[PDB]
Amino acid sequence: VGWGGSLQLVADMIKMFFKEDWIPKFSDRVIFTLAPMIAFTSLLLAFAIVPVSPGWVVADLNIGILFFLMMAGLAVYAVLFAGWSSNNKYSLLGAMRASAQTLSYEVFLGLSLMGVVAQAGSFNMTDIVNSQAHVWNVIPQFFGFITFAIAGVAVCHRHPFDQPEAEQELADGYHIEYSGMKFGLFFVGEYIGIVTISALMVTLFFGGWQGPLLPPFIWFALKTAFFMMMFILIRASLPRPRYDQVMSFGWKICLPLTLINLLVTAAVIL
Amino acid sequence: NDMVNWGRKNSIWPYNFGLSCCYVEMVTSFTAVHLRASPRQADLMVVAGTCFTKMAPVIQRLYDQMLEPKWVISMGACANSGGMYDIYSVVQGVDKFIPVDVYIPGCPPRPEAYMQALMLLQESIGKEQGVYRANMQSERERKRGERIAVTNLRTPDEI
Amino acid sequence: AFAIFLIVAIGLCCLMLVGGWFLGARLRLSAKFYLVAMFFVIFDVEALYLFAWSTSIRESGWVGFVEAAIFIFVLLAGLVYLVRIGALDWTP
Amino acid sequence: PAWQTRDHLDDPVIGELRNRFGPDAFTVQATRTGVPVVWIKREQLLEVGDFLKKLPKPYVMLFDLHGMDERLRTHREGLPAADFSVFYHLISIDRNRDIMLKVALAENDLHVPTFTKLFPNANWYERETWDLFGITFDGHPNLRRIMMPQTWKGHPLRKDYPARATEFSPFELTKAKQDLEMEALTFKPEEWGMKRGTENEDFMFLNLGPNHPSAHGAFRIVLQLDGEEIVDCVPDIGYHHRGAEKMGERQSWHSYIPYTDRIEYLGGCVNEMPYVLAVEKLAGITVPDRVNVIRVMLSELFRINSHLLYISTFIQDVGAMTPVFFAFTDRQKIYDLVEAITGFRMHPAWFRIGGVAHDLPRGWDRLLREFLDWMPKRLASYEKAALQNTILKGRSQGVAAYGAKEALEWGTTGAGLRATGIDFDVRKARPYSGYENFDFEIPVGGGVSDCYTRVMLKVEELRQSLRILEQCLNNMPEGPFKADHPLTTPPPKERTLQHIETLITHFLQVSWGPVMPANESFQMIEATKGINSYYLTSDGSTMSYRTRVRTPSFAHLQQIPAAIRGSLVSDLIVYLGSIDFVMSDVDR
């Protein structure tokens, strides 16, 4: 039997390859093609700001945070041009409600990230990775960390569980009208999304490149693997939350939590 | 190279269209072998149950929706042919209007029959026409000397 | 650098798309109520002041925390206002 | 004997009807149904029904409405001259009695006044009569074809219509292109029911056909939407019509038995029990006690299986499905006992006319005892998991509730009807198969029928079934598994293999079929869902002349639009899940 977990994804990717592509009649063509890469390239270039190594840094630019937020905001357009390219009022309204809850739950990540970038005081990732030298920026900001966790798992990572189905009738999940390689593009996009959110979480909240007794790049890789396994454990444990309950525990509960988080960090930093 | 064939053997996506009856055994099979199956995404459609005259257009639209490489497994005697219901309201087999590749007799078939259907269907997918001059070998002919050599069976007054 | 990675990414996009080609009126009550997303459009602009704030806070000090508390208190008052009037509720 | 042909003319209802209407109109048939069958010209149907509805102990529930062809019956002693007939089976619960009314019709004037005004649930039944026969019911609100498509010419239950698909043209795809053209142009003519609302921007027409899981088969429920409200819901049923009733006319008494197993896929031997009971009532066969206890054992096992399936699916759809998936393994264990007895997991086809196919193998008692000691701890784990849970209990209260009167008028029987205050079981009112020597209770919900009441009642009935099954394990007596009578079909096989007269009886019984004398029988039982009955008419031949199968699920699915009117789509789906309906049962 197959001994590797990834070999299933390998066979799936091969399968999505070499599949005939059909043209949809009475449909726009540019957005039908462009909606996948707005979801794919965004979290692909979200990987361009990680300090994987001082000597093998992918990009030594001065600002990486704003690029991440720019991709976070851009991601919605993929669900919106997918909704309009569905050309079915059911599916279109399904993608409209999915983008609704998306914009609703994407609010929190910037305000949660303000705490760590304020105690870091810089946008260049070398300053953040040099800040976690003795004390990591996770002990004081428990609330900010969990709020960023909720926001990161809320961006089309299947935790809401309203993507391929709809709790509300008269509408349908927006992954139906794409069936060629674009569907494999969706899966690879969420895969690079989850691994890049995990990498950004480890390198921005915890301490990357520490190396207590072993070389620090494999220390980063193993810690990222532990957080990968914990993310998968809680994603599986997390049940599907209906649309209502998600709207109830959204803007009400975590906007005050992050506002008092900013108050706490601003009060303790001076 | 034939890597594409390995790709198609290794991974397949099943579209479960089981009807009123005969789907409880299919569920018994699916919950052991495996919300992933989605319309317009699968390349395998396991037609089970009695294909009724009224709902046959539904099966024809679902057949039209899937991509060019289409595989179909007929399960049960009610889907291979009309089965026991040779009546005005039952079509005499699903092969009348869609091409079929594998036929799984029974009423209802067993989950192990579904497992052997996946094994014979990856075996067929690994020899490419589609017949390829290899599918003339039949289970009637392959295990014939196995089945004829059977002499004794347990008496049916025991558990 | 970033430019090299961007060129690599766009070249991969061109390679996959070219390879793919070679491989071969009235809604009535439905929809509407996007105004939560409009609340996001305005609230992101509110939080953009905190986006600019978060870079320089050590030199800001006590009046900075004071007027940031006033700012988020105004936002909290507006939020509870929208909740209590019934604007922010169950939505289609 | 309890099978002898009686007229029931002495019954008090016969004398009350004789006093009110005097003489004439009434012809008292002689049958073995146990109930009074009366013929009533079509000009008195509404009078008779109205009088019976208000009679000092009224017939509150219309059990059945269907038609009979009757054209080819040579044995017609005592009946009036009829070329067609329509029968109406009514039941008085306060009398625990039934009455059957037959209206005779001639071939040139197939017209009868509609009965829906007294009992609304008759509407679809009359619609079926328009579909399967060609009787037009004047005064019917929506008289359309309910089983075949709207362009199907011919009435399939006429005897001049060829029964089998072979006599028609094969699937040449001549109709696939026309059905495709029709389906592509999906528009509403406003003929799908009343459709009071017009087709404009004000009202939206949505097929709303659930193809998702737990739907219990694929069906459509055309819905009119205004403000996301259920303005009018019209089900489109008949997709799973297999023509079982028509099939009954062209099969012998013995070879039809497999078809009974597929009226309800989950019922199994419960579906066979009424058929064998009716055939043995025609034969005049009294079975031994061992046959009775064996039949009770198999029926309580299948009933337990059905109750466990309903509980499992309900807890999974509106609650936490993590623990209850162990019941799936338990269902496999129940199956290993069934295929230990009968042979095959589903569709056992094990009951025979006069008995069962074989005796129990000698290791049956240890397996049943192991299942009976093992099950109660799991049953109490489900009892704590379901009585004490709060989330679904709070969610599942007052969700499209109705009362006793509402259940009575809509013909709804079973857990739905037991959820109201009417204490009516057939195993106590009309004991059959030796239930009268056992002690079990009928739980009842009070006056409100909802999902919590239904599951609590189903658990209590499962406990009573387990008490019956242990009493069957501890008091199984000794003796034969087949009655001693020339019409016991088949004979004991060891006797067939050695004795010439038994071999000849077996030869003609399995080849031409047993000759049952011309008479009409009728049996109803408590099924896994509601009350299921079989009305069989024989013309003296080896095949049934008319087979009528009353399934309660048809009524349960017909009732939803009356109660769910004024609710959301989510409440609709929850109600559809709650109601005990299976598509195979609705379309027979």
Ligand code: SF4
């Ligand atoms: S094959 Fe058997 S179980 Fe399946 S639908 Fe036909 S009769 Fe029912």
